[PDB]
């Protein structure tokens, strides 16, 4: 390439795959696409390993509220980066609420076909879609 290429962080992926599940969820379709940072955070902690994920915020985290607020602020920051990428749009007057777009489906590129995960991953790296860490 004549133009530089870069990769997203693993926290960005966690927020990306969660935003993807949120888009699909018919249970929340009644919101008309408007979600709150707190709802996103609540869904994320419901699915992923909370205490093990906390390791990325700080190597000494053990469930303290200061560390929980630090995690929430990192989420707030990464979500803002995804907005610049065009993956989510904030409301015109309220920044605690936002709307999703279909571009988030790229986070599901590792599972859209019901096949061997290793082979899928190999195919993706071969196509230049994704890198390991």
């Amino acid at each position: 390439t004549l133009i530089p290429r870069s990769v997203l962080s693993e926290l960005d992926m966690m927020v990306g795959k969660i935003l993807c599940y949120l888009y699909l969820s018919p249970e929340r379709l009644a919101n008309q696409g408007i979600f709150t940072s707190q709802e996103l955070y609540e869904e994320l902690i419901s699915l992923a390993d909370e205490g093990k994920l906390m390791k990325f915020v700080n190597q000494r985290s053990s469930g303290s509220d200061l560390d929980k607020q630090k995690l929430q602020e990192k989420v707030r920051t990464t979500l803002n980066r995804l907005r610049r990428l065009g993956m989510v749009y904030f409301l015109p007057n309220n920044n605690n609420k936002f709307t999703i777009t279909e571009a988030v489906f790229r986070f599901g590129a590792d599972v859209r076909s019901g096949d061997d995960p290793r082979e899928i991953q190999l195919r993706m790296i071969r196509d230049g879609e994704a890198m390991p860490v």
């Binding site: 609540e42 000494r60 469930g63 303290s64 509220d65 200061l66």
Partner: protein, 290 residues
């Protein structure tokens, strides 16, 4: 089935697999004690994260430590206490993410050992012996009245297991406290003899006589009550043997008899050890005077 179902090798393997460890340096121990005191002054037995941080700040101030990173240090200390099983943390969605803290049975037992001024009381022992004598008498009467497995489980096994066994454990703990008090008197006698031995002879003789008198009063109280307690345990054993014989009641009565024999034997052994030390101190005083 032995209260401790695990052999020493099974227990050591279990402890190693679970990675259990306790590391409470002076600052961490002071913080645990401050938390225990703050919890005792409250109406709900619950502490918030901010209140724990304020308590840690007071400990850091008492240790004249730098006010830098105190919030981080307090979080590390709180996480360490939770990680060492001294505090239980409750994270409720209803509490908007605010965690509620309560001390564990372990954290309370360690903090109470240092903060609770436990003195051996002949009155406490006499009361505990009076309650257990009444409980054993009621269990013996119920055992002699006879009945079904439900009568024996509710009126004989439950009182022996959940009341008599706990009071015997409390008496044993009081005896262990007396063991510590004797070691404290020994340190005081060694200190009085190291400062001014000539002026300390009268004080040492008084401490030796008073400790001997207390041990004798305790042993006399235990021997006087011990026979009545052993008679009631034998009454229950005879009644159990006559009404088929629950192996669970027999094992429990045997454990209680063994604990009672240990409680009675401890008093005689403590008196013998104290007599040996008394003779040693008098020999030392005679050698120093000569």
């Amino acid at each position: 089935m032995s209260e401790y179902s695990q052999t020493v090798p099974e227990l050591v393997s279990w402890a190693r697999k679970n990675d259990f460890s306790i590391s409470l340096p002076v600052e961490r121990l002071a913080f645990l004690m401050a938390i225990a005191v703050l919890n005792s002054e409250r109406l709900d037995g619950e502490m918030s994260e901010g209140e724990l941080i304020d308590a840690f700040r007071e400990v850091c101030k008492g240790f004249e430590q730098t006010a830098e990173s105190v919030a981080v240090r307090a979080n590390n200390a709180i996480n360490d206490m939770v990680r060492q099983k001294l505090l239980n943390r409750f994270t409720s969605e209803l509490a908007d993410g605010n965690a509620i803290y309560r001390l564990t049975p372990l954290g309370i037992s360690i903090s109470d050992y240092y903060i609770r001024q436990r003195e051996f009381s002949t009155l406490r022992l006499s009361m505990q012996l009076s309650i257990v004598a009444n409980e054993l008498h009621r269990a013996a009467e119920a055992a002699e009245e006879g009945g079904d497995e439900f009568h024996w489980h509710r009126n004989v096994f439950a009182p022996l297991k959940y009341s008599v066994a706990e009071i015997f454990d409390s008496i044993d703990m009081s005896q262990r406290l007396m063991d510590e008090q004797q070691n404290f008197v020994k340190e005081d006698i060694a200190a009085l003899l190291n400062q001014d031995w000539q002026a300390a002879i009268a004080n040492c003789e008084q401490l030796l006589s008073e400790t001997s008198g207390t041990l004798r009063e305790l042993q006399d109280t235990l021997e006087a009550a011990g026979d009545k307690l052993q008679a009631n345990l034998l009454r229950i054993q005879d009644a159990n043997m006559g009404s088929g014989g629950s192996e669970l009641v027999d094992k429990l009565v045997f454990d209680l008899q063994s604990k009672l024999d240990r409680i009675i034997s401890w008093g005689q052994q403590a008196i013998d050890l104290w007599i040996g030390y008394d003779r040693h101190v008098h020999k030392f005083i005679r050698t120093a005077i000569d």
